[PDB]
Write a protein that binds this ligand. Structure first.
Ligand SMILES: Cc1cc2nc3c(=O)[nH]c(=O)nc-3n(C[C@H](O)[C@H](O)[C@H](O)COP(=O)(O)OP(=O)(O)OC[C@H]3O[C@@H](n4cnc5c(N)ncnc54)[C@H](O)[C@@H]3O)c2cc1C
Ligand SMILES: Cc1cc2nc3c(=O)[nH]c(=O)nc-3n(C[C@H](O)[C@H](O)[C@H](O)COP(=O)(O)OP(=O)(O)OC[C@H]3O[C@@H](n4cnc5c(N)ncnc54)[C@H](O)[C@@H]3O)c2cc1C
Lengths: 595, 595
């Protein structure tokens, strides 16, 4: 048995599915009376009373029979590659696939940039760090399968500076930044040095409720599911007997919040997220020695069918006049590619919304889920210096990250070059949201002609000097700078359009059931991190792929290989609720309805 | 006398100033007891009881005496040019100025792109339309002063298509898009065809309160000042006895909302905004024949001192060790420019936050106001066709704008080429927020090499065909396309960083008093649309400039030219509350405090 803290996210997700399916089943039994796949008897359905799987008798463990089939994988990020890897391992007779990549590059949001092919001469533009928590079992299994060299990622370093209001942070000092009301600021005195615990308090109130009675706690959490984290703090709602915080208190919390947007996401999932690290929040973090793109390389090279880059799918369709399995097609550069029995789309939702999907006959609400989700921006700037001055001169010897209200916002000291004494890469700027958009405005796809330094480099070098002024001069940093740098803004990437999906108030609880269920007669799948309760991480991408493969096997009643899937590829807690009294078959049925 | 509807925005803004000043005065009288500029007597101060202007006896109407002074204007957008125009007209003896422009282009968010120098061969990337409402008096005066050729802007056209859920809009049809619950959708049946009135209802409830008792209404509006428009609709708060709307209802409202973001701004200013057009909302709209940049041209050419382009200010400072007037300086490309008695900064706040402002010794809360405000993204795509097929084939003969859930979102039919039969420009895509970021990801600063068509053009042409499918084929539009197009995304512009400031919940009421008040001993001014209650429009930019010039004249006690300013340059309702019992002098004093 897994303890409560590690089980709540999955229980939460599964309950959300049941809530939606029950309403849609009631509605359809009140819109058609009969539902294809069920035997309706006589509002009726509810979240803890849904029909059993009528096909379960075939799923109990207890050559060329399978007709030749071909599936299409849209996207060669980690989700698409994982689908292909699973399919390869299952070795389904006469089953083949095409995997199309829009970019010339494979990997998607797994993206290491190499300045040279020198050992440590890189930086990760996408995913870079991985926590050893139980929800990440599937991820670390993939690392094992592909033989990834894992090293320690230092989240908290030594002597990393913090700079706000042009004051450096100092331990055991009341309001070191001098921004509190007592020192002529507007930040409330009870908040300025206690941001972390006020937040933990707000979440802890609902974590405590869920702990002793989940359903009761779930019902209470639903009352704040329709509000942002900022809103909850600005109301203490919904009643609200919870502690209030004025405008400047919350603004200071947001200021101190570097990293992805939290205050504009649903408070309910902010609460769920605080369970993620309650084994507790001192697990070990890991990164891949040589860059995350080593995973991409290992995965794409073991594929039975090679990734086709520079193939941008612009339309997806199904021919319902044709009774055969392979009646689906995609359009690439004006050319039709047909004969597919299933299409897995693994792109970011913005990319999918850009396609012509009329041929799929998607229901408007599912089309909404694809269109309406926002993506959080992220930008990275990396600079090469002739020596690691932060290690040697500043005493920053074990990674970590600096924080400031300066434009660069965060400076990340690499965990993979701690012993180097020569040329060294620094992740000088790591930003999110509006900060990332601002730095991104300075990042141009066509770099300046050597050796001219543009506004971005000049801004970063100046910010770095002020941030490390306790040990470094601006002159010294400029001299140490080799003239080599690279930068990347994800919202400017047409193939992705942001770091990862942001779920606003009510968006996950209402749209996640739609993103997870099949379409086009159970032949179309929306795959990717955003389609999973484990979103914004690799695990979400990997779990979504596993889920979609399940529903694909279920669609064509390949019970032998469905069982094989459950034996070989089930890691951690399974997101999809399968079994006789599960909901996977109901999502399948709702996603396979005729027209 | 002006009627209530046209006075509420100014009364609202002036009251917000009084609320903040009263708190800061009480605080400072509880932090220092004495305040430089006042004679404190003995919590005490309140919004309707603030000290009179001790210098008013000099301001009542009732050669070279003025020492030589020089001021710096940062930014050659419409705000900076307007400052220069006012200064020129006042002809203050021995007063000169430098105006520095970061871009090679003058005009900022006034930006017409000319494909050729042909008569109608352009499109406006920034501001383009201007409503004849009383708040716009200052704007139309500027148009008159510069001799702008005004023509009719058609907001609502004829036969403009609307496309949602792949259904075209049709009058007198219940749920034409088929997205309501009754037709298997999730949009509530009472909302789907009545979005406009449900919104008007929500605002009308508070507009009604303000109408009969402003202060009482103001106090009630403050209770919803800390919530978004979406939040208010999702709560009916704050009590809340107001009508509720579920997730899909509000999502449909947002979907139908093309144009700038509204649902994430404060509900309080959403209410105030609904007064903007209550003379009512059928005023005439105007645009400038030949493009908005004609205004920029007229303004910059009449300037006594020519705009210096390619001059990016990277730092602003004041020398408090020096008792002389001109003790301020700016840094441009590593070079110091000194001798300034006042600096007017007119840049977008993101640009100002990018500067080194340590030499100004800004108070942390004012620095917050500069840093924390978000900007709404906007993107435009314009295409040239060999003939105006929308006029000739589609019957769209009087401008207007199409609306769709397709990627291009809105298609604007130009009001300045209605009679043309040959080559014609179409504003094929006009987007905001996340939509603008997505289209913007396809807009690259280095265009494709002729005559290759990139993903953006292909996407737009396909969307245009579906949008105008009632009269046009995709083939026909492709043939009509000349191969010439241009696109621009404002969040990608490092000199601006977005369309205009977005004021989230609580942000205007709390930060506007800081953005409006001087700094650095009353010698530094934050100027621009975001510094005004009339923000996101040209009037806000123009009113901010006028306000800053007032405080500049007041700082150096130039009463002769201060009076001249009030006689010649006072248009519409004055935002800044001046007079004996005003608050301008208190903002000045709070903004001139020593260190
Ligand atoms: C900056 C950043 C930091 C992160 N940090 C971490 C971290 O520390 N740890 C962690 O576990 N996760 C992290 N994440 C998230 C993680 O990287 C993602 O969840 C995951 O990589 C996404 O995988 P995916 O295959 O679902 O989507 P993607 O990687 O986006 O794959 C989609 C692919 O489809 C392609 N595509 C798009 N449009 C089309 C089209 N029309 N036709 C064909 N192909 C198309 C794209 O090019 C892309 O390659 C981070 C992400 C980012 C951006
Ligand atoms: C797409 C769009 C549509 C709009 N629609 C309308 C409309 O229909 N009607 C309407 O009235 N208004 C509209 N607005 C708003 C209006 O255009 C603006 O309010 C106004 O033009 C902004 O003027 P400004 O001088 O305050 O700022 P800006 O125009 O931004 O001027 C600031 C200047 O400072 C410069 N600068 C930046 N950084 C530096 C630096 N470090 N050193 C020196 N200079 C620097 C910039 O290049 C810029 O030129 C629209 C705006 C946009 C973007």
């Amino acid at each position: 048995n897994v303890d409560f803290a590690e089980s709540v996210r999955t229980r939460w997700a599964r309950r959300l599915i049941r809530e939606k399916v029950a309403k849609e089943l009631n509605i359809l039994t009140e819109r058609l009376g009969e539902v294809p796949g069920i035997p309706p008897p006589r509002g009726g359905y509810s979240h803890d009373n849904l029909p059993s799987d009528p096909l379960y008798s075939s799923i109990k463990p207890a050559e060329e029979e399978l007709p030749p089939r071909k599936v299409c994988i849209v996207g060669a990020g980690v989700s698409g590659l994982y689908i292909a890897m699973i399919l390869d391992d299952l070795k389904i007779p006469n089953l083949t696939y095409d995997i199309f990549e829009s970019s010339s590059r494979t990997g998607g949001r797994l993206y290491t940039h190499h300045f040279t092919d020198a050992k440590h001469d890189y930086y990760d533009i996408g995913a870079m760090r991985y926590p050893d928590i139980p929800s990440m079992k599937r991820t670390f299994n993939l690392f094992k399968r592909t033989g990834m060299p894992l090293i320690k990622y230092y989240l908290d370093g030594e002597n990393t500076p913090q700079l706000y209001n042009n004051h450096f942070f100092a331990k055991g000092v009341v309001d070191p930044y001098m921004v509190s009301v007592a020192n002529g600021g507007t930040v409330p005195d009870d908040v300025v040095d206690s941001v972390g615990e006020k937040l933990q308090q707000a979440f802890g109130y609902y974590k405590e409720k869920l702990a002793e009675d989940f359903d009761k706690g779930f019902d209470e959490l639903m009352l704040v599911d329709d509000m942002t984290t900022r809103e909850y703090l600005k109301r203490g709602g919904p009643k609200g007997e919870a502690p209030k915080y004025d405008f400047f208190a919350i603004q200071w919390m947001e200021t101190q919040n570097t990293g992805t947007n939290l205050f504009d996401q649903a408070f309910s999932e902010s609460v769920i997220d605080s369970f993620d690290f309650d084994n507790p929040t001192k697990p070990e973090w890991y990164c891949i020695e040589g860059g995350t793109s080593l995973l991409v390389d290992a995965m794409k090279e073991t594929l039975v069918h090679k990734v086709q880059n520079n193939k941008r799918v612009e339309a997806i369709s199904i021919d319902l006049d044709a009774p055969d399995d392979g009646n689906m097609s995609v359009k690439i550069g004006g050319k039709d590619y047909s004969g597919y029995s299933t299409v897995f789309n693994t792109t970011a939702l913005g990319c999918l919304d850009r396609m012509d999907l009329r041929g799929l006959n998607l229901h408007p609400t599912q089309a909404d889920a694809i269109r309406c989700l926002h993506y959080d921006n992220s930008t990275k700037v990396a600079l090469k210096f002739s020596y690691p001055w932060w290690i040697k001169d500043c005493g920053i010897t074990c990674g970590g990250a600096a924080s400031t209200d300066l434009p660069l916002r965060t400076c990340v000291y690499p965990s993979y070059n701690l012993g180097d004494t020569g040329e060294a890469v620094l992740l000088a700027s790591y930003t999110w949201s509006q900060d990332a958009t601002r730095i991104g405005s300075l990042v141009k796809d066509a770099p300046p002609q050597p050796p001219k330094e543009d506004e971005l480099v000049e801004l970063i070098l100046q910010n770095l000097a002020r941030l490390h002024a306790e040990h470094m001069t601006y002159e010294k940093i400029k001299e140490a700078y080799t003239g080599v740098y690279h930068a990347y803004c994800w919202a400017n990437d047409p193939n992705v359009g942001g770091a990862f999906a942001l779920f606003g108030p009510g968006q996950f609880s209402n749209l996640y059931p739609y993103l997870m269920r099949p379409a086009a007669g159970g032949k179309f799948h929306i795959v990717g991190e955003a389609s999973s309760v484990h979103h914004a991480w690799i695990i979400g991408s990997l779990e979504s792929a596993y889920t979609a493969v399940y529903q694909f096997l279920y669609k064509y009643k390949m019970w032998d290989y469905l069982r094989l899937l459950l034996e070989r590829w089930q890691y951690g807690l399974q997101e999809l609720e399968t079994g006789k009294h599960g909901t996977a078959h109901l999502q399948f049925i709702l996603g396979s309805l005729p027209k």
